[PDB]
Symmetry: D3
C-alpha cells in the first residue's frame, strides 16, 4: 500500500496548498504520482501542458514525485500504476460530503482503490486555485499563493 | 395531500438513488407524478426527450407513477395537477439548506404547496447523476449506478 | 404507509415548530401518534408526565392525533403500532447528517421502518426547545415560541 | 473604521435580502458604498449598467449610501476609498467557510481590510438572487422578492 | 448603533481568538462591553469571578473596552446599555446556523437588537476555549493559545 | 511517517466503523497503535479497562496492531512512541471542521505530528458509538454494529 500513491487534481494552477499535500504525502509513499487531469468540462484557465509543466517544476525538489497528465478515469489510471491509494487534501473549504462521495465512487470503479486525506499547513488552509485565478484575472498580485518559480508564467498567461 | 405527490428533477440521467425515492414515495401517495424539468440553465448531458424516455422506462413497474416533462414553474405545475406536495430526496451530498430555501420559495409561489423528504437506501446515499455523467463522459462503466432499463441508452 | 405515522421527540417543551410538524403530518396520515420519549439521558427540564400533558393540551384540536409516552426503542414502538413511517421535522439548525444516520439506524432495527421529513413554517424555522428552556431558566418571556395552551404550565 | 464601509456584490438583481443588509450597515457607517462588481466570470442575467441602475433606484431613500460599479479588485477599490471594512450578508444558504476564505483573501490583498457580517431579517433569510433569476427565467412573478423600484425594470 | 457594542461569552478561558474579536470590534464601536455570562448550564472550568478577572487582565490595553459579568438574559443587559448591537466572532468551527438562530432569538426578545459578526486572524481561526481546557486538564502547555497575562492563572 | 501510526479514540464501544479504519490503516503502516483515551470528561458508558479489553479482542487478527490505554495528552503519547502520524476516520457524521481544528491543535503541541484520514466502508459510514450506546441502553440488539467478539461484553 505504501509503495505508491496518486495525488490527482486539475491544478489550475498549482498552489502553495497543493505543494503542502505533495510534501507530506511524498514523505509517506515510496513513490508519489501527481496526476494532472485534463478536466475539459471545467474550463481550466491554464492548458493541460502549462498545468503539467508548472507542477513538474514546482515538485523538482521532491525526488520520489513524478507528475503525469491523464485523460481517462482516475480509477483506471490507478490500475495501470498498480496503485491502491488516492491521496486528497482536506482544507477548510473542502466539500467533505463530496469527498466521501468521490471516494466511494472511485472504489466502486476499482474495488482495491482507497482514498487517504492529508491536511495542508494552517497558513494554507484557506488557499484555493479559484482565488488565484480571480486575483490574476483582475490583474492583482497572487504571488503569495503559489510557488515563486511559476508565478511569472501565471501572472502573464 | 395523500392523493398526489410530484417528484421533480432534471434526471440527467435517472439513477438508482432517484428510483429508491420513487419506490418509497409511490408507496405513500395514491398517484405519483415524476416531473422532468427542462433545466436548460443547467446544461444537461441528455435532452429533455431522452430524459423523459429514460424515466418512463425506469418506472414502468410502478403502476401508480406517471412521468411528465415540464417547461415552466414547478409551483404552477403543482397547481395544474391540483397537488399540494412536492417530493424530494435527502442524500449525503444533498445541500440541506438549499432544499429548505427551495421549499420556502415554492411555497411563496404557491401557498398550499408543501415539500416532503424521503431517504434513498443506504447503499445509494452517495450516488449522484453527476457521477454517472463523469463516468459516461470518460467512456467508463456506470451500469452499477442506474436502472438496467436505461443503460443501453446512456452507454452507446 | 399512509395508515399511521409516528412523530417522536423529547418535546421539552413542545414548541410552535413541533406543532407545525404535527399540523402537516396529521394532514398526511390517517392516524398520527405523537410519541414522547422519556429521554432520561438528556436531562429534561420537564418531567415525562409534564411533557405528555403539555403536548396533549397543544394537540387537542387535531382529531386524529394521539399522544403517548414511551420508555423503550422507537423501532419497537413502531412495530407495536404496525407503523412503517417515522415523521421528523427539518429546521435550519437540524443536523442533517445525524438525521440520516438515525433514519438508517432505525431501519436497521426494524426493516420496514422509513423516515419521512416535513418542514415547519418559515417564521418557525429557527425555533428550538433549547431556546425556550434558556429563556425560562432566565425568567424571561417565551410565550412567542410555544402554543398558548401550555404557557401557564411552563411559566412558573 | 466607522467612516466608510463597502458592501460589494454582483446584485443580479438586488433583492429584499440585500436591501436589509444595506439598511443595517448604512445605520452603522457614516457612508456606505454599495459596490456592484462586473462579475463577467459569473454570467449575470442583467448587464453591469442595469444592475447599477436597479440598486441606485432601490437605495434612493438611504441618504448616506452611494452606489458605484467596479471592474477591478475589490481590495484595491477599498484602498481607493480609504475603506478598512467590507460589509457582507449572512443568510441561511450562505457558504460560511467560503465567506471566511474570501475575507482572508481580501486581507492578504489589502492588509487593512476587515470583513464584517450582518444578517437580513428572518423573513428574508432564505431569499437569493438565483431564485429571482429562476422565477424570471420561467416567466413567473418575483415581485415579492425584490424592491418595488426595480420591478418595472426587471420586466424589460 | 456605532456608540456601543456588547461582545458576550462564557470566556472559559479567554483565548487569543476572543482577543482578536475584541481588538476588531473595539476599533469599530465608541465603547465595547465584554459581557461574561455565568453559563451555569455549561459547567465552566473557571468560576465567573476567575473568568471576569482573566478577561479584565487580557483587555487592560484596550482603553474603550469594559468587562462585566451578568446573570440573566443578554437581551435585557443590552437594554440597560441602550445597546443595539451584539458582537459575535465567526471562526472555522463556528456553528453557523446556530449563530443565525441565536441572533433571531435575541431579536425576538429585544426588537432593537442586531447581531454583527467579526473574524479573528487566520492564525487563530481554529482556536477554541474547549481546546485550551483539554490541554490544561491534561497538564499540557496551552501558552500559545491564550493571552500571556492569563497563563500563570490557568496553568497546570 | 510510514513506520508507525497511532489511531486514538474513546472507543465507547469500538464499532464496525472503527474496525474498518484499523483494517485500512494497519495495511498502510508497519505498526499501528490503537490508543484508547480515558476521556473521563465524556463520562463513557464503559470503563477504560473495559474499552481497552474490547479493542484488544476486536484487533486480535491484526498482527501489527497493539492497543494501549492512555491518560495524558495524545501529542505526548505520539512523542513517547517516536510516532509522527495520527490516524483518524472520516464518516458521514464527522465534524469535519472540528477534525481540522484538532489536527492543528495536535501539531501545535507536537510540531512534527501530522494527522491522516481514512474512510470506513460505505456500509459502515453511518455507524457511531453513540448509536450503539442508545440501543444497548434500551436492551436492544446492537450485534449488527460491533465486532461479534465484543458483543457479549456490551449486551445489556
Ligand atoms: C481531477 C479530479 C481528481 C478532481 O480534482 P480537482 O478538480 O483538482 O479537485 P476538486 O475538483 O475536488 O477541487 C476543486 C478546487 O479545489 C481547489 N484546490 C484543491 N485542493 C487545493 C489545495 N490543496 N490548495 C489550493 N487549492 C486547492 C481549487 O479551487 C480546485 O480546483 P478548481 O477551482 O480549478 O476547480 C476528478 O475530477 C477526477 O478524478 N477526474 C478524472 C475523471 C474521473 O475519474 N472522474 C470520475 C471520478 S469519480
Ligand atoms: C428541477 C428542480 C426541482 C431541481 O431538481 P434537480 O436538478 O434534480 O435537483 P437539484 O437541482 O436541487 O440537484 C440535483 C442533483 O443532485 C443529484 N440527484 C438528486 N437526487 C438524486 C438521487 N436521489 N440520486 C442520484 N442523484 C440525485 C444529481 O447530481 C442531480 O442532478 P444534476 O447534477 O444534473 O444537477 C428545480 O430546478 C425546478 O423546480 N425547476 C423548474 C423551474 C422552477 O420552478 N424553478 C423555481 C424553483 S424555486
Ligand atoms: C426521542 C428521539 C426521537 C429524539 O427526539 P428529540 O430529542 O426531540 O429530537 P433530537 O434528539 O434529534 O433533537 C431535537 C432537538 O431539536 C429541538 N426540537 C426538535 N424539533 C423541533 C421543532 N420542530 N421546533 C422546535 N424545536 C424542536 C429540541 O431542542 C430537541 O432536543 P432537546 O430537548 O434536547 O433540546 C430519539 O432519542 C429516540 O428515538 N429515543 C427513543 C429510544 C431509541 O429508539 N433510541 C435509538 C434511536 S436510533
Ligand atoms: C462581487 C463579489 C463580492 C462576490 O459577491 P456576490 O456575487 O454578490 O456574492 P457571492 O459571489 O459570494 O455569492 C452570493 C450570491 O447570493 C446573492 N446574495 C448575497 N447576499 C444576498 C442577500 N442578502 N439576499 C439575496 N441574495 C443574496 C449574491 O448576489 C450572489 O448571487 P448570484 O451569484 O446568484 O448572482 C466578489 O466576486 C468580488 O470581490 N469581485 C471583485 C473582484 C475581486 O476582488 N475578486 C477577488 C476577491 S477575493
Ligand atoms: C453567553 C452566550 C452568548 C453564549 O456565548 P459562548 O458560550 O461563549 O458562545 P457559544 O456558547 O455560543 O459557543 C462558544 C464556544 O466557542 C469557543 N469560543 C467562542 N469563540 C471563540 C473564539 N473567538 N476563539 C476561541 N474560542 C472561542 C469555545 O469552545 C466556546 O465556549 P465553551 O467551550 O466554553 O462552550 C449565550 O449563552 C448567552 O447569551 N447567555 C446569556 C443568557 C441568555 O440570554 N440566553 C438566551 C440567549 S438567546
Ligand atoms: C480521544 C480523542 C482522540 C477523541 O477521540 P474520539 O472521542 O473517539 O473522537 P471524537 O471525540 O473526535 O468523536 C468520536 C465520536 O464519533 C463516533 N466514532 C468515531 N469514529 C467512529 C467510527 N469510525 N465508527 C463508529 N463510531 C465512531 C462515536 O459517537 C464517537 O464517540 P463518543 O460518542 O464516545 O464521543 C481526543 O479527545 C484526545 O486526543 N484525547 C486525549 C487528550 C488530548 O490529547 N487532548 C487534546 C487533543 S487536541
Amino acid at each position: 500500500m505504501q509503495k505508491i500513491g496518486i495525488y490527482p487534481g486539475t491544478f489550475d494552477p498549482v498552489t502553495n496548498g497543493h505543494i503542502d499535500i505533495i510534501h507530506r504525502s511524498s514523505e509517506l509513499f515510496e513513490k508519489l504520482i501527481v496526476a494532472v487531469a485534463h478536466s475539459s468540462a471545467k474550463n481550466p484557465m491554464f492548458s493541460l501542458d502549462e498545468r503539467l509543466k508548472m507542477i513538474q517544476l514546482a515538485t523538482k525538489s521532491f525526488k520520489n514525485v513524478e507528475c503525469v497528465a491523464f485523460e481517462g478515469l482516475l480509477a483506471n489510471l490507478a490500475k495501470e500504476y498498480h496503485c491502491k491509494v488516492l491521496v486528497r487534501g482536506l482544507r477548510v473549504v473542502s466539500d467533505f460530503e463530496y469527498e466521501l462521495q468521490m471516494g466511494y465512487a472511485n472504489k466502486s470503479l476499482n474495488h482495491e482503490l482507497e482514498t487517504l486525506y492529508f491536511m495542508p499547513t494552517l497558513q494554507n488552509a484557506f488557499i484555493s486555485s479559484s482565488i488565484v485565478r480571480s486575483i490574476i484575472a483582475h490583474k492583482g498580485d497572487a504571488s503569495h499563493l503559489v510557488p515563486k518559480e511559476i508565478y511569472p508564467l501565471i501572472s502573464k498567461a
